[PDB]
Amino acid sequence: GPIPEVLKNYMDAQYYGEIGIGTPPQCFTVVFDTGSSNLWVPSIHCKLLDIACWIHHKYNSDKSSTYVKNGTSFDIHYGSGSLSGYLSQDTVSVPCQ
């Protein structure tokens, strides 16, 4: 039918919901952003410089049986934040199911 995603509300400023990457699903929270078109989560291979990554959930490819590597680099600049990493392929689940 329609698939409901429940969103959390942080201070009427951040609304995010939970999704899974991998088999079995590793759960992450993301904002469903209608202002961009890329999906990204922190890598467990994020560099030490990436302070943000220390305090968030990181994705580990080696724990997913359906992961297909891609490795191509990407660099996204939002009108606020900037990030970069490499691309990868796997199943995305919404909710973390």
Ligand X SMILES: *[C@@H]1O[C@H](CO)[C@@H](O[C@@H]2O[C@H](CO)[C@@H](O[C@@H]3O[C@H](CO[C@H]4O[C@H](CO)[C@@H](O)[C@H](O)[C@@H]4O)[C@@H](O)[C@H](O)[C@@H]3O)[C@H](O)[C@H]2NC(C)=O)[C@H](O)[C@H]1NC(C)=O
Residues carrying an active site annotation: 33
Does 87 interact with ligand X (rule: CB under 6 A)? Answer: yes
The residue number whose beta carbon is nearest to ligand X equals 70
Among 14, 24, 63, 65, binds another protein (CB under 8 A): 14
Distance CA 70, CA 88 (A): 5
Query: By C-alpha distance, which of 74, 75, 59, 66 is closest to 19?
Result: 59
Verify binding: residue 72, ligand X, rule CB under 6 A: yes
Q: How far apart are CA 49 and CA 89, in angstroms?
A: 25
Contacting residues toward ligand X, per CB under 6 A: 70, 72, 87, 89
